[model samples]
Target: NKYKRIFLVVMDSVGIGEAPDAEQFGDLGSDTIGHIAEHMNGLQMPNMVKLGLGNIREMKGISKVEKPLGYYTKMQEKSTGKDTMTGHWEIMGLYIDTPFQVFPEGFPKELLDELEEKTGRKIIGNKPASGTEILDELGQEQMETGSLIVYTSADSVLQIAAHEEVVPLDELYKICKIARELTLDEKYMVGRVIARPFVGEPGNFTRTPNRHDYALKPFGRTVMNELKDSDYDVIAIGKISDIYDGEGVTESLRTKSNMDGMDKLVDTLNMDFTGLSFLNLVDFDALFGHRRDPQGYGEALQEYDARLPEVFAKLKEDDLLLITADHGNDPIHPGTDHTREYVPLLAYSPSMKEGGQELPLRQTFADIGATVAENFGVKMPEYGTSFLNEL
Candidate 1:
């Protein structure tokens, strides 16, 4: 097996259906793609449909082709949590047995007190909230008092929100970095500490483009680390670098939106890369899912679909393209949180002898990493069974 370059895209929070253990996470009927299609009357993804996007599920407006143009299936997560960090980690062969800490009732006083003491600023909004809603609720006070708008979500994250004018971007990032360090202990093992900087008036406040995520380092070796150690390049676009806490990445490029991410991916395709070019398009989750806007979610998917040809056109014979999702954030779900659901796996290669194939339901997200390792003849990660031969 010789795949000189592997291009992987994580369509953030794009799940197909509920997982077997969805009930445990209170996401029983959550379906990101399905609900969006249903709401939009039918999802218009011609490029994806040809690549067998409809083959994995009974998606509306995307009928399964008799002989699709790619290998497709749904992958289940072996990790315990359904957040962005957990899903991405599991995809690269890191299985989380014990879930990361989540503060549904809000963080403790002691932790907030420590953060305030270290950052030299009083904190407010230390409770669970939607990012936009919280800013709408307290953005004015934050602008006036110079108080840090600290908040949490359904995920295991500690978010510090601040107006860019009141608090410097670097200063907000500095506070988040300190909080990230503080959360290393078992008592507060948060998945990520995010700096949410915004700009504008009280009612018209909008998050700026200078968001940063301080994530906990991966506990064990991921395929990315292994690839980097083997002298292979690992190019991370969007928050891939931040999600891994800057570990195992050779190059990184930040993106402003999904279109920007796609543009970056196309730019990277022209450059020479050996191992992996991993991309995370966060707009699907951030803009639509969290806002519970099915129309916008469906539109985003279609927009990405329109850009698929650029990816296919840039593919070399030895290049393999993998399109999948980290987890599900169903717009129609009860809350603005990630859902425990299966993610679609679509694999395509220009040099493959076969075009269409039905891959089995992968037991874990690590299978994708394992397949890449197998293709490169590298040491396999601890989890997942390789489906390289099948491809």
Candidate 2:
């Protein structure tokens, strides 16, 4: 039980590069790490640098340091799909070969008809869209007609955008709640029904912080489930609780912003959790990355980089800290959809033996799951091979 603790932070959509199958997803050359560096004219991550993370630049495979201070790696996702749920599950040892259902052109007539029938309100824009752009384009019309701006994004979501003046917040939320519940079937299994509530006049619409995520239940029991089941601590900070839909989370904390999330991360580290402490700092992905704001994304990364020392200082002798991303959404990319890119995995621990090294390119993100399973003396699902033992 001494080495029973693990902290996994998912920098959602902070991918390093496009995998071999990236082209299939229209993401052949996407590179979050490279682009961020380019945006910042060579970004500085001193903590990661000291851990021999430079090897990631040269290694096509999971990169490892010759004499690492911790385990480092860049991993591809084996899941056929490249969305939040898919990436998160693969990291927990489940490779979802079958991509989830997506309402590409828009939700089918039947689904829309049902929503209209139930809510007694006409809906518009069910097609793929950016939350901000779609609102601007339709904000005026929405105010006039009181129509709900129902849009789908690159992620598996059926987002309902609404102007507060045009639609009542409670009524819009209720519509979204029903949409979230209705997508339960195999025919239209959306991952989230985001409440993209916005305020302000035409051409100046601003999305509120009431954004909510109703994710599909985890495909399989993840590290959280394993730890909670085994009576180990499973603390989820920020959107970590929402992303997993309350499944497998023992203690949960909601954050108002990145600083609040980091504060919780520090608080959790100080607590007596004998299992896993998970953090998902989402501002980079949700606020900046999807918006394709290079400057904003760069600033977010820089801010986290500045706080890396606090994380380093919090690791206990027997505890481990692993940082990686769920997927990629290049802020400089053309679209808001998540790109099929490799995610970097970094593992550090104070009690690690001298062999702390960066690993070569891993075949799939599931290796992270295997690593957690290895740490807890549990069996990983039949997907990825663990390199945790090598460290």
Candidate 3:
């Protein structure tokens, strides 16, 4: 009952296998880790293999180890949707009743009209487009007129990119704020309003640090909130802060890459602290998964594996580390969005006495949060059963 610190690292969109509802999500043949490992002629993740990752599910390259170092199982997502926010929030003990609304065909004229009126900036480009491409096409015009360049993507985000000189950070963020309030309408229901502040000219423009995202708050209280409210350290790394909209977070650290995230995790590990430190390594999803690059996905996994021992080497007794993913984005899958799939749940602690102790296939991602809540004696979430006792 006194495990001092818990570290949860979510391999964003690194799903193990297709979920039961794959067909409904248009992801029938999607198997993110499975396909990537097979395509790479199998992953060489020995440290992970020792942790019974292979025991959780069979893939082409990684076979089960005889004597494992920890417990492993796969958790099926029970949330109504398969987006990043829903998957992550569910992992932290909130059951999303419906998917966050997405705008596939770009935002509506009605909403854009209100945005332009409120911000007093011309709203141009209500299209789903790439940030660089959109800016390249219209950045010159935007600079000349101080117009707002708006765009969307496959995900439910309304992005506004503009030159920092003309629009300014304060003004750009204000535009995004206005858009967030407007999209709050159930009818629009857009998931995020992002500010993509950039500098320099059209050909050489680059994004600025002022870039930020505005996300909807979690529908209700989560395990994170309970633990933070109880005075336990709840440190969030990478996009975990952005996904939760900073709720229930005591400290937030951003990362540049998966390896950077690993370094920051180790850094945090070195510091004395109690409670949960959550990391979201997003390269598997951002650079490879969404771009449909299995080779890169496979290679990134290998790269990620190379750094596991650093975390393993730093673990102290009475420390618990849970490694899992939020959802899947199969590079070989048809669409370039998330695929409904089962995320692997691997549990390990230096104090553990056994290996290859298998956990039941969890019904909800909330089991992870439930375990943390039970460990800290906080308010238990309405969803998920705690496996702390089992661990």
For TM-score, the strongest prediction is 3
In the range 1-391, model 3's lDDT, one tens digit per residue, is: 5589999999989999899999888899889999998789878788788898889887777889887888889999999888888988899999998677546457779888888789878988888677888888888888998899999875678899999899879988888988899988777776789999999986787878888888888989989999999998999999888888888999999998999999999988997888999999988987888779999988889888889888889999788999999899899988577889999999899888755489988999999999999999999999998998887
Q: Which candidate number maximizes lDDT?
A: 1
Residue lDDT tens for model 1, 121-149 = 99999887888999999999999999999
User: lDDT of each model, Cα atoms only?
Assistant: 0.89, 0.77, 0.87
**lDDT of model 2 at residue 321?**
81
Q: Where does candidate 3 stray beyond 4 Å? A: 101-137, 152-156, 164-174, 185-188, 197-213
Steric clashes per prediction: 0, 13, 0
Q: Which one wins by TM-score: 2 or 3?
A: 3
Candidate 2: where is the Cα deviation over 4 Å? 58-67, 100-114, 117-120, 124-146, 149-155, 159-189, 194-215, 353-355
Ten consecutive residues with minimal summed lDDT in candidate 1? 97-106
The better candidate by lDDT, 2 or 3, is 3
As for model 2, its CA RMSD to the true structure in angstroms is 4.8
lDDT of 2 by residue, 179-293 (tens): 8778877677787778888899988889998776666777777766776777767788887776678777899989977778888889988888677788888787767776788
Q: What is the TM-score of each predicted model, taking all chains together?
A: 0.84, 0.80, 0.89
